[PDB]
Amino acid sequence: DDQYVLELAPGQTKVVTEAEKWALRAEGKRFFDITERASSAVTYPDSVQHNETVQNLIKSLDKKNFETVLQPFSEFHNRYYKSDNGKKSSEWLQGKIQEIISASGAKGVTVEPFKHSFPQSSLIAKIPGKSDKTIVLGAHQDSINLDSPSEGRAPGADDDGSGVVTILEAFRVLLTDEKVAAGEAPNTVEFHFYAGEEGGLLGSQDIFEQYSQKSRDVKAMLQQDMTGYTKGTTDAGKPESIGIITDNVDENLTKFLKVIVDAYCTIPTVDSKCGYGCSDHASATKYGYPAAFAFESAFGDDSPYIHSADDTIETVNFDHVLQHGRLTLGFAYELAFADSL
Ligand SMILES: *[C@@H]1O[C@H](CO)[C@@H](O[C@@H]2O[C@H](CO)[C@@H](O[C@@H]3O[C@H](CO[C@H]4O[C@H](CO[C@H]5O[C@H](CO)[C@@H](O)[C@H](O)[C@@H]5O)[C@@H](O)[C@H](O[C@H]5O[C@H](CO)[C@@H](O)[C@H](O)[C@@H]5O)[C@@H]4O)[C@@H](O)[C@H](O[C@H]4O[C@H](CO)[C@@H](O)[C@H](O)[C@@H]4O[C@H]4O[C@H](CO)[C@@H](O)[C@H](O)[C@@H]4O)[C@@H]3O)[C@H](O)[C@H]2NC(C)=O)[C@H](O)[C@H]1NC(C)=O
Ligand SMILES: [Cl-]
Ligand SMILES: [Zn+2]
Ligand SMILES: [Zn+2]
């Protein structure tokens, strides 16, 4: 005591100290932290159906908005989920989401905190549709410095500030569609900003456990974690691409994600695996929901600065973030209007 229980592979657990937990992370191992829960097909459209509408919404994306939000978000000393910094950064992000909702005038759209047993709350923004079939867009809002998690500097600009501002800007543009804002889409859309991802997927485990216990009908979940770093790709002489993960994800949903990238982005896809417990999509998968995951690059070309003080906004390519904004908008809109899910 304190003893943390980690799940490193299906049905395989290890009891560790907190220091050993961060040492595992530093070696590249991921896991679910299951300390508090110690014993714990959908067919998609074959092609895009709303190309004219989505192409017009894409013209409203503004890459200056990514940097306007990411700069002050990264100025929190860290956004560590067990720190008062992480409570304050979540409250700040909640205020930014609320400013977008209030300025849209969309009567039924809300954001609410999801409480956890640590100071940093997750955030869920909801766009009600005509049915409770739900499409989820996710990113994690916490950051960590693995050499000193509680008090170490962690700007978290790429990991995962980039994903946060990607889906926040897609959320803003979605609310400019009159039918979506009025609640007339056949399906409900939610934007999730997960707390405590760096501690072992703590916030997304809580959310999808509760959704499963309440029989929430999640028809698709897309996670984005690190959407901004292209220098590794360009240094290697490789084509700028959207990375698509192929393990711990739903195969049909991943095929649909590639349809979305082919239709709405101007760069190609590149497949990789990233292992067990890799990001918050793994929590959706664990609790039985179909999930997919996109990120910045091919395997091994991602930011080498993550989990340190050097994960700064100067490493982020906002033209690449814009490509992820386009795919987020297309994924959300096409599935919001997929009445056969
Ligand atoms: C959703 O909706 C959106 C709309 O919002 C849809 O957008 C459409 O998307 C498609 C696909 O992405 C686009 O098609 C592609 O468009 C470009 C057109 O680019 C213009 O420039 C060309 C180059 O011109 C320069 O160079 C010439 C050299 O001769 C100069 O003379 C010029 O001055 C320029 O400097 C130009 O050639 C094009 O002209 C053609 O189109 C006009 C407009 O209709 C005609 O007047 C012309 O006569 C001529 O037909 C154009 O003005 C093209 O480059 C793409 O063509 C390639 O791909 C075709 C399909 O594969 C293929 O048949 C062509 O031969 C061509 O192939 C060439 O390129 C390949 C690589 O790309 C090579 O491998 C190959 O060897 C060959 O060299 C293609 O036409 C639409 O433009 C775009 N439309 C709009 C309105 O935005 C979107 O499709 C929708 N999505 C869905 C439904 O999923
Ligand atoms: Cl990471
Ligand atoms: Zn991350
Ligand atoms: Zn991380």
Boundaries of every domain in the chain: 4-337
Sequence-ordered list of residues with C-beta below 8 angstroms from that of 107, at least 6 positions apart, any chain: none
Ligand 4 ion: residues within 5 Å (CB): 159
> b or e along 48-81 (b: 16 or more beta carbons within 10 Å of the residue's beta carbon)?
bebeebbeebbeebeeebbeebbeebbebbbbbb
Ligand at shortest distance from the CA of 139: 3
Cα gap 82→88, rounded to integer Å: 11
User: Which of 46, 48, 51 to mutate to test ligand 1, by most ligand atoms within 8 A of the CB atom?
Assistant: 51
Cα gap 292→321, rounded to integer Å: 18
Lookup: tokens for 91: 């409250």
For ligand 3, the distance from its centroid to the CA atom of residue 279, given in whole angstroms, is: 7
DSSP code at position 75: T
The amino acid occupying position 257 is: L
Could you give phi then psi for residue 43, rounded to 5 degrees? -110, 135
Could you give phi then psi for residue 81, rounded to 5 degrees? -70, -20
User: Which of 50, 55, 258 to mutate to test ligand 1, by most ligand atoms within 8 A of the CB atom?
Assistant: 55
CB atoms within 10 A of CB 299: 12
Does residue 123 sit in helix, strand or coil? strand
For ligand 2, the distance from its centroid to the CA atom of residue 99, given in whole angstroms, is: 29
For ligand 4, the distance from its centroid to the CA atom of residue 307, given in whole angstroms, is: 6
Ligand at shortest distance from the CA of 262: 1
Place of tokens 């008062």: 84
Cα gap 172→102, rounded to integer Å: 11
CB atoms within 10 A of CB 237: 6
Taking the CA of residue 47 as reference, the ligand 1 atom at the shortest distance is: 94
Residues 238, 301 contacting (CB under 8 angstroms):
yes
Lookup: tokens for 74: 């990264």
Ligand at shortest distance from the CA of 226: 3
CB atoms within 10 A of CB 211: 21
According to CATH, the superfamily of the domain at 4-337 is Zn peptidases (3.40.630.10)
Cα gap 251→262, rounded to integer Å: 17
Sequence-ordered list of residues with C-beta below 8 angstroms from that of 64, at least 6 positions apart, any chain: none
Lookup: tokens for 101: 């909702």
Taking the CA of residue 48 as reference, the ligand 1 atom at the shortest distance is: 94
For ligand 4, the distance from its centroid to the CA atom of residue 198, given in whole angstroms, is: 6
Cα gap 277→300, rounded to integer Å: 18
CB atoms within 10 A of CB 281: 29
Ligand at shortest distance from the CA of 264: 1
Residues 142, 120 contacting (CB under 8 angstroms):
yes
- The binding site for Zn(2+) comprises 140, 159, 198, 225, 307
- Experimental method reported for this structure: X-ray
Sequence-ordered list of residues with C-beta below 8 angstroms from that of 80, at least 6 positions apart, any chain: 86, 120, 142, 143, 144, 145, 149, 150, 154, 198
The amino acid occupying position 23 is: A
Place of tokens 């395989």: 12
Taking the CA of residue 262 as reference, the ligand 1 atom at the shortest distance is: 94
Taking the CA of residue 263 as reference, the ligand 1 atom at the shortest distance is: 94
Lookup: tokens for 225: 């974690």
Cα gap 306→133, rounded to integer Å: 35
Residues 137, 149 contacting (CB under 8 angstroms):
no
Residue ranges lining ligand 1, Cβ < 6 Å: 48, 51-52, 55, 263
For ligand 2, the distance from its centroid to the CA atom of residue 306, given in whole angstroms, is: 7
- Resolution, in Å, please? 1.6
For ligand 2, the distance from its centroid to the CA atom of residue 279, given in whole angstroms, is: 7
Q: How many residues does the chain have?
A: 341
CB atoms within 10 A of CB 20: 13
Ligand 3 ion: residues within 5 Å (CB): 159-160, 225
For ligand 1, the distance from its centroid to the CA atom of residue 227, given in whole angstroms, is: 28
Does residue 237 sit in helix, strand or coil? coil
Residues 159, 142 contacting (CB under 8 angstroms):
no
Smallest CA-to-CA distance from 192 within 74, 34, 332 is with 332
